[PDB]
Amino acid sequence: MNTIAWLGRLVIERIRGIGVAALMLLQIIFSLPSAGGFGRFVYQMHRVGVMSLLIITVSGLFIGLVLGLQGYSILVNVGSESMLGTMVSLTLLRELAPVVAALLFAGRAGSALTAEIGSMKQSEQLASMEMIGVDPLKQIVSPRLWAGIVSLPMLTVIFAAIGIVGGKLVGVDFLGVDEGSFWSGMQNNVQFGHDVVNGIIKSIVFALLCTWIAVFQGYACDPTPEGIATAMTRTVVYSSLCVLGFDFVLTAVMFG
């Protein structure tokens, strides 16, 4: 009965680990900012956001070419493909662009923060910063958290806009559907406040979880060159489970 005893010891440490990461979040956001805190947030928007711009724009095109090619092969048997422009822009705006653009943000810019704060912990830069008197949560961690909550909802819109434009390329200009019935099928069925705004609120709840996890794993490492790399797979797995987990809860509320 050791394996049952080891399994129960595993999920007790993982429960306690949530409680440390909850108390770490209440110390960051319940504080008025220190002098100079906006100059570092603009710089941290460059590392997290702008470097992630190339992967999202390219991969957003490749889903749009697939959604236009799969939606045409199904809607041609029933002979109604004036709804092609609807189902492409309805699959992206409420479902795929909130979800897939959080599965690529957890990889590229999610795990990179855990390496960045993690390598500062093994090389004692975090411990050296505290003896000077500077608190490393306000100095290092907090400009990285606020640059994650802002930079992902700005990236699902670029994912959704490039995905529709890419779906317009293979649907209208390669397979040969009508251009005017493509766009006029959108404005009838796709509202703004029910679909585009509910695709943004779905990504703010996703941007909080892919950043608060990816910061806590790099702050509570164990300082070891092979203990860092084991916490970079702990933050890609835990982000992809909370994205798909809060997907169903937010879909049932918004579209139920």
Binding site: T3, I4, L7, G8, V11
Partner: protein, 191 residues
């Protein structure tokens, strides 16, 4: 508190076992045998599109599914065998004194007792026996056919009763059949 590392190793595995049976219940690989199921038969000619685990409805209510479809190539017809459910189609003791009675008060009737009246005693003592016996709620007047429910397909079986003073038996032959009437006939008549 050593058991706390063992009370959680038990409620993790068991909660991982209970998520395997509920994936074998809602999938159709373990379970969904029918309570007091009995599988009757009939012979059709057109059962196209009629899958296994289909629908079988009596009035509006689903009672059973379809499993088995035979092709009898000596005389080419189809032959179907499907399970009903005994909870809605078979009688119990409170109704059994009623379902023995509801034909018995019509056994002694203006129609069926005045039916060579010396055989009022023959139509009373020999009936009740088999009656109280194995007999479902299906008449002999009922015909079974294939229907579809809607402009797109389901293809289910339908049992249309007709009343009567006689009822069928568990696992028998429903001897009034009818196949489907789509494509060809349809288009032809609809010009």
């Amino acid at each position: 508190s050593r058991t706390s590392e063992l009370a959680v190793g038990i409620f993790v595995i068991i909660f991982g076992i209970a998520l395997f049976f509920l994936a074998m219940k809602v999938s159709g690989l373990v379970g969904t045998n029918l309570s007091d199921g009995y599988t009757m038969k009939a012979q059709f000619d057109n059962v196209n599109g009629l899958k296994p685990r289909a629908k079988v409805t009596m009035s509006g209510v689903t009672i059973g599914r379809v499993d088995s479809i035979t092709l009898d190539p000596v005389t080419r017809l189809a032959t179907v065998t499907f399970d009903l459910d005994g909870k809605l189609t078979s009688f119990n003791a409170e109704q059994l004194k009623e379902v023995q009675k509801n034909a018995l008060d019509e056994l002694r009737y203006s129609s069926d007792y005045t039916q060579a009246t010396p055989a009022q005693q023959k139509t009373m003592e020999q009936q009740l026996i088999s009656n109280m016996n194995s007999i479902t709620s299906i008449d002999e007047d009922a015909y079974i056919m294939v229907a579809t429910n809607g402009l797109l397909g389901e293809k289910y079986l339908k049992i249309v009763p007709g009343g009567g003073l006689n009822y069928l038996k568990r696992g028998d032959t429903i001897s009034n059949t009818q196949g489907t009437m789509d494509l060809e006939d349809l288009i032809s008549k609809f010009i």
